[PDB]
Amino acid sequence: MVGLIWAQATSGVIGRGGDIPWRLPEDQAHFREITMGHTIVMGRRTWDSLPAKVRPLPGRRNVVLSRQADFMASGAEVVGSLEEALTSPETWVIGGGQVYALALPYATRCEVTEVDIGLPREAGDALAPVLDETWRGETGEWRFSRSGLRYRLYSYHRS
Numbered sequence: 001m002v003g004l005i006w007a008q009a010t011s012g013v014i015g016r017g018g019d020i021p022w023r024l025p026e027d028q029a030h031f032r033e034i035t036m037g038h039t040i041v042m043g044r045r046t047w048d049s050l051p052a053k054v055r056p057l058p059g060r061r062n063v064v065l066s067r068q069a070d071f072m073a074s075g076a077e078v079v080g081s082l083e084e085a086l087t088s089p090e091t092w093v094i095g096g097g098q099v100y101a102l103a104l105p106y107a108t109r110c111e112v113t114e115v116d117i118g119l120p121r122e123a124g125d126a127l128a129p130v131l132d133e134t135w136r137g138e139t140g141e142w143r144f145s146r147s148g149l150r151y152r153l154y155s156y157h158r159s
């Protein structure tokens with residue numbers, strides 16, 4: 001089972017200038033809840049973006065995709081292809097735009113956080129993959145975060 005987990009603005013934007021363009025700590029808690037105890041797969045840029053205090057993310061087997069020979073990621077497994085990355089039975093792909101695109105075909109679950117923020121797409125932005133009709137979804141109720149942003153969770157699946 002390969003799942004993808006991401007937080008996106010309603011417009012599909014998930015990253016800009018190498019960072020996530022909003023603050024929503026409740027989404028980080030959700031992320032932890034979903035991924036804890038499992039293998040997580042991320043692109044090298046997503047690895048770089050992790051704050052040092054949680055790089056690697058604790059309690060999870062961190063796997064980082066890179067095309068670089070001896071890319072160095074302490075506390076993580078560096079791999080050069082998706083096949084070497086997606087070997088675990090319960091894998092969560094945690095970003096970024098490139099890796100979500102790459103991994104979507106291997107996925108059977110998506111855990112999406114929609115952030116109700118006006119953020120029109122700009123050239124060069126990292127974007128969420130677009131889910132077609134092979135996916136069945138369940139939409140959660142809107143919630144307000146302490147940051148003032150409304151947000152909701154979506155759980156998608158396909159067999």
Ligand SMILES: NC(=O)C1=CN([C@@H]2O[C@H](COP(=O)(O)OP(=O)(O)OC[C@H]3O[C@@H](n4cnc5c(N)ncnc54)[C@H](OP(=O)(O)O)[C@@H]3O)[C@@H](O)[C@H]2O)C=CC1
Pocket residue numbers: 005006007008013014015016017018019020042043044045046047049065066067068071079080081082094095096097098099100102126
């Ligand atoms: N809102 C959210 O939920 C999340 C948002 N993000 C955001 O996403 C952005 C980063 O996304 P993006 O720029 O797309 O980068 P990625 O994190 O997807 O990393 C891309 C890197 O992964 C490696 N890579 C890609 N394809 C392959 C392949 N086929 N084989 C081997 N290595 C491969 C390369 O590493 P190399 O260059 O080393 O070869 C490439 O540069 C940031 O802005 C981040 O904040 C990230 C996670 C979650």
Ligand SMILES: CN(Cc1cnc2nc(N)nc(N)c2n1)c1ccc(C(=O)N[C@@H](CCC(=O)O)C(=O)O)cc1
Pocket residue numbers: 005006007020025026027028029030031032049050051054057058093094095111112113
């Ligand atoms: C930059 N980044 C990538 C990140 C952020 N939010 C996401 N949110 C979702 N829904 N999905 C992702 N893949 C995702 N990835 C980060 C930054 C911090 C932590 C982080 O501190 N996390 C702690 C928990 C912290 C909290 O519980 O507020 C964890 O143990 O998972 C996670 C990912």
